[PDB]
Ligand binder design. Structure first.
Ligand code: HEM
Ligand SMILES: [Ca+2]
Ligand SMILES: [Ca+2]
Length: 349
């Protein structure tokens, strides 16, 4: 791909002149999709959308003579009436419908738009890696088949096999991509309440997800026994069965614990695996690097430690599963155990 370094009308230099148009997309989605550049519900939904668009690719199926999906091809938006009805994709038609208009107005491909919005969404969350953005995804011509996006009730072996088929990702990289549950909430698992976060800092890209999933689960935050849900350690926080089990499985437990108190490994690994997800089904050497359009991510504000135990929790509440290295001794925030506030989603989530 021949790139032509250029200075856009806003005065910024980018690696290719074709990237300049994405500055108008950026300003539009920041004000009109993310309410002023927030790391709130639409940002969270947009990050989730990247994975549900991209992981739907299967070389194993292609080897059996069946279409296995095009990976990061924007199919979930183009064929939203089909894909968003798949149970793993529950609640994603809401964000697809909020995103659709931007695609049509700016004339960008659906796949490139999903990857762009995911990167911009993450750049709005303090602590996020400096995110990449490559263009070049042609519109999907066929919807993905079902059975490709992991469910919260799937076993660890099923999920490991699924991501290995999809992109040759190993079990370590499976843990890295689950860092996105550090900026995320659950709207459709518990039918009585929407917006329960996976960690106590859903607006901060940090390792609280990895700390808090390792604590002993003691209660359900809303109703009990929903499929794919297990007890969590804090009021207001939800824990799903897949994350609970991957944190405790001997193949992935030490990599899961490796992010605790290690911000630079969290940022580097997630930067890497997020980019890889957005290139599934594509030829990296045929894409254009428009990463200079993505805003600079901001640091976490304040002076609290990077990782900590939430108030009322100590090392005694950790279910140690990594046999090679002891869970780190973190500080405990002072005061009484406090509930995690929910993140109400837009209508239809
Ligand atoms: C690998 C297996 C995974 C499983 C089983 C899984 C499961 C889930 C479930 C059950 C929810 C809540 C969905 C709902 O209530 O509608 C969710 C939300 C979310 N997931 Fe995952 N996830 C996985 C991997 C990923 C990955 C790789 C990413 C990102 C690259 C991701 C990003 C998110 C985000 C950001 C949310 C929050 C959505 C919101 O706030 O509306 N997840 N995940
Ligand atoms: Ca797709
Ligand atoms: Ca967090």
């Amino acid at each position: 791909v021949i790139e032509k370094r250029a200075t856009c009308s806003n005065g910024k230099t980018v690696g290719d002149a074709s990237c300049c148009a994405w500055f108008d997309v950026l300003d539009d989605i920041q004000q009109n999709l993310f309410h002023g550049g927030q790391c709130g519900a639409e940002a969270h939904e947009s990050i989730r959308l990247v994975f549900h668009d991209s992981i739907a690719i299967s070389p194993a199926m292609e080897a059996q003579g069946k279409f296995g999906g095009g990976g990061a091809d924007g199919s979930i938006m183009i064929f939203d009436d089909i894909e968003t009805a798949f149970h793993p994709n529950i609640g994603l038609d809401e964000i697809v419908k909020l995103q659709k208009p931007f695609v049509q107005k700016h004339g960008v491909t659906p796949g490139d738009f999903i990857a762009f919005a995911g990167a911009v969404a993450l750049s709005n969350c303090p602590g996020a890696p400096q995110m990449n953005f490559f263009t070049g995804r042609a519109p999907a011509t066929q919807p993905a088949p079902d059975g490709l996006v992991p469910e919260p009730f799937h076993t660890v072996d099923q999920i490991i096999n699924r991501v290995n088929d999809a992109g040759e990702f190993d079990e370590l990289e499976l843990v890295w991509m689950l860092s996105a549950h550090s900026v995320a909430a659950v709207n459709d698992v518990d039918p009585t309440v929407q917006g329960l976060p996976f960690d106590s800092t859903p607006g901060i890209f940090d390792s609280q997800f990895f700390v808090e999933t390792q604590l002993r689960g003691t209660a359900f935050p809303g109703s009990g026994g929903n499929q794919g849900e297990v007890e969590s350690p804090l009021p207001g926080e939800i824990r799903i069965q897949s994350d609970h089990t991957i944190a405790r499985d001997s193949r992935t437990a030490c990599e899961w614990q490796s992010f605790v108190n290690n911000q630079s490994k969290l940022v580097d690994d997630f930067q890497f695996i997020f980019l890889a997800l957005t290139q599934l089904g594509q030829d990296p050497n045929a894409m254009t690097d428009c990463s200079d359009v993505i805003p600079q991510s901001k640091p976490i504000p304040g002076n609290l430690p990077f990782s900590f135990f939430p108030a009322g929790k100590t090392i005694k509440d950790v279910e140690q599963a990594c046999a090679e290295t002891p869970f780190p001794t973190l500080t405990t925030l002072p005061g009484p155990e406090t509930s995690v506030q929910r993140i109400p989603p837009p209508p239809g989530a």
